[PDB]
Amino acid sequence: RQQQQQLNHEASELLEIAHIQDDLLERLVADPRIPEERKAEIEEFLDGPIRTL
Amino acid sequence: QDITMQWYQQLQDASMQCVLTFEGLTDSQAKKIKMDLQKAATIPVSQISTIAGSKLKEIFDKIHSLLSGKPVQSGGRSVSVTLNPQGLDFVQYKLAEKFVKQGEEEVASHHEAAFPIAVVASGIWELHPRVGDLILAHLHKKCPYSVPFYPTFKEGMALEDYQRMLGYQVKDSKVEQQDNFLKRMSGMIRLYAAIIQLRWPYGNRQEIHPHGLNHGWRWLAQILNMEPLSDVTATLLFDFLEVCGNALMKQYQVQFWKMLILIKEDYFPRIEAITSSGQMGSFIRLKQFLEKCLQHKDIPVPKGFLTSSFWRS
């Protein structure tokens, strides 16, 4: 049970961070006040491995 | 861009054929005639910025009369072109260049003057298409960025000769500055961006625009499909969309916005890499102009656009 919970906990935390990152990326791309040049740069660094908080 | 450069060469070498047709115009009275035509063919264009729209038709007819064969008042004595085949070919050349010089030394200083000059150039082009090809010839040489084409630095030719191709005004001594050169280039395409959208109202014209608004779509497409120059591109792009973005939005509803939600994502990051922070003035205002338009979903009418109130008083 200990080994199960430790993995379910690591997946729960990483999923919480991933959803934050997805909410950010979506909002930044859609934001009218963001220049196009920057958006492509945001999509490169956020649409991949999960970043630190 | 072979298709465009071929057409570019045609207007260029075809104007050069005109350089050859009146070489005989280059006696005591023969010099008086050359001045009288060069004079009575460039003063009217210089007054287009300083007149009331109710009176602006006077200059159009005065240009149309002189150019169609009729006489016109220049000073005290009357001038004509009838039975003056070199004078006719001579006036079309100086007229076409004066339209560009005005976009070079007046529209650069005052952006509002592009529209009253564009309508008159658009109506004369409409009635006399040869004058229009000469208008494109000088516009192209003095401003290659209006073709559009970026001239490349070449080996085997002097540096000064290459700087002239870029449109830098050079006296025999030295080249002109860059800040005054960017203004000359702006004013020239704000004039051109106004020509491709405005139409001379009077005359009851059945036919199509001489140089239609179609040439405005390709120009934007043709400069965004090539790598941008550091400062020119970001400047000329702004003062083109501000002048002709409204007329381009109406004609191409969805296709223009797709092209506009593209520069923000793809072409804007490209300009940040090539330009140092010291000369970002072009790219920084290129975004201030959009961010409003993007959320407003509308491009303001160019400040200085002609309205009906202009044509009555």
Side-chain angles (χ1 to χ4, degrees):
Chain A
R1 191 190 273 95
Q2 277 300 134
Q3 211 162 18
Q4 297 173 188
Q5 290 172 193
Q6 277 175 10
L7 180 51
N8 162 267
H9 189 72
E10 190 183 25
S12 291
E13 279 191 335
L14 286 166
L15 178 58
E16 187 175 40
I17 301 175
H19 276 310
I20 292 169
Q21 185 167 327
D22 195 45
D23 285 348
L24 266 165
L25 169 60
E26 298 275 310
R27 191 178 296 185
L28 292 168
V29 163
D31 196 322
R33 263 168 49 81
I34 301 297
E36 254 61 43
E37 318 292 25
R38 175 62 185 176
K39 288 185 180 177
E41 189 181 354
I42 293 168
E43 199 170 319
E44 185 192 346
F45 287 84
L46 292 187
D47 185 16
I50 302 158
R51 304 265 248 139
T52 71
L53 289 172
Chain B
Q1 303 189 149
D2 191 19
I3 51 176
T4 305
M5 292 306 307
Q6 288 176 355
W7 167 69
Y8 165 83
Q9 275 297 338
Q10 291 201 62
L11 295 161
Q12 230 62 54
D13 53 46
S15 178
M16 266 152 50
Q17 294 300 332
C18 198
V19 175
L20 291 179
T21 304
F22 63 78
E23 186 158 354
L25 299 182
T26 59
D27 307 330
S28 67
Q29 286 297 110
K31 291 176 182 180
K32 185 183 176 184
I33 295 169
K34 177 180 190 176
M35 189 184 80
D36 282 19
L37 298 192
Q38 194 197 302
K39 187 187 189 198
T42 65
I43 302 166
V45 186
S46 54
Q47 333 178 184
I48 291 177
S49 59
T50 61
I51 197 157
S54 44
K55 292 181 190 168
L56 183 56
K57 200 208 175 185
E58 291 174 356
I59 294 160
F60 188 92
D61 294 328
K62 206 161 64 77
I63 296 167
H64 186 12
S65 301
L66 188 279
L67 192 143
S68 192
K70 291 180 175 180
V72 161
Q73 293 298 329
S74 73
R77 299 295 183 187
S78 305
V79 42
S80 60
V81 173
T82 305
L83 192 45
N84 213 303
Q86 319 210 68
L88 164 62
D89 277 312
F90 169 71
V91 86
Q92 292 188 332
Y93 184 89
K94 290 293 178 174
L95 176 63
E97 98 175 342
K98 186 60 165 130
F99 272 130
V100 178
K101 289 180 75 218
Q102 283 299 136
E104 176 188 75
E105 72 206 17
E106 180 170 29
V107 178
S109 302
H110 309 290
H111 291 328
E112 293 79 12
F115 310 102
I117 299 171
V119 299
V120 176
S122 171
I124 298 294
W125 192 335
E126 213 168 6
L127 295 169
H128 315 280
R130 177 160 46 177
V131 175
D133 285 23
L134 271 45
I135 281 173
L136 290 176
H138 303 208
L139 176 65
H140 279 356
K141 184 169 177 286
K142 277 185 174 200
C143 180
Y145 316 91
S146 67
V147 176
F149 96 87
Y150 295 154
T152 66
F153 191 16
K154 70 279 190 48
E155 312 181 358
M157 282 305 311
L159 179 62
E160 194 183 12
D161 289 16
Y162 163 77
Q163 287 165 307
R164 288 173 184 254
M165 271 185 84
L166 285 163
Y168 276 98
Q169 172 173 350
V170 317
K171 203 61 161 177
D172 288 356
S173 56
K174 73 127 198 166
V175 304
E176 175 235 314
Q177 309 187 1
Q178 191 258 50
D179 60 337
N180 286 13
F181 153 93
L182 212 61
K183 270 184 196 172
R184 270 176 52 266
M185 298 285 126
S186 282
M188 268 186 196
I189 78 160
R190 311 202 84 145
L191 180 68
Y192 178 67
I195 284 172
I196 57 169
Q197 61 173 350
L198 307 182
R199 196 169 168 86
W200 188 242
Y202 310 136
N204 305 316
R205 298 295 303 176
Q206 307 280 332
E207 43 266 66
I208 320 98
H209 200 289
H211 207 74
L213 182 131
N214 45 277
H215 292 90
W217 171 267
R218 76 173 178 77
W219 188 90
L220 292 173
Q222 204 146 212
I223 69 101
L224 297 171
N225 296 339
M226 49 174 35
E227 221 60 31
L229 298 195
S230 60
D231 196 38
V232 175
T233 302
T235 292
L236 299 185
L237 183 61
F238 157 81
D239 54 44
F240 191 103
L241 297 171
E242 169 167 306
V243 167
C244 207
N246 182 27
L248 285 163
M249 181 185 63
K250 303 185 290 214
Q251 194 72 16
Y252 313 114
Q253 296 175 358
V254 69
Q255 292 292 333
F256 194 63
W257 277 119
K258 288 205 303 179
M259 173 176 287
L260 287 179
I261 66 180
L262 176 65
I263 59 188
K264 197 191 186 165
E265 292 184 355
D266 295 16
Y267 212 75
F268 278 13
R270 281 235 167 284
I271 295 170
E272 301 203 25
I274 316 191
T275 306
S276 84
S277 182
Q279 66 205 275
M280 293 294 271
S282 307
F283 172 84
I284 189 62
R285 287 187 185 278
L286 186 68
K287 206 197 309 190
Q288 280 210 42
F289 171 75
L290 281 183
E291 278 189 80
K292 282 197 174 206
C293 293
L294 271 287
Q295 180 61 16
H296 286 65
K297 308 293 173 60
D298 172 31
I299 296 188
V301 178
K303 301 190 187 79
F305 210 91
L306 300 186
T307 57
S308 304
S309 175
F310 160 88
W311 293 107
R312 306 189 292 270
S313 296

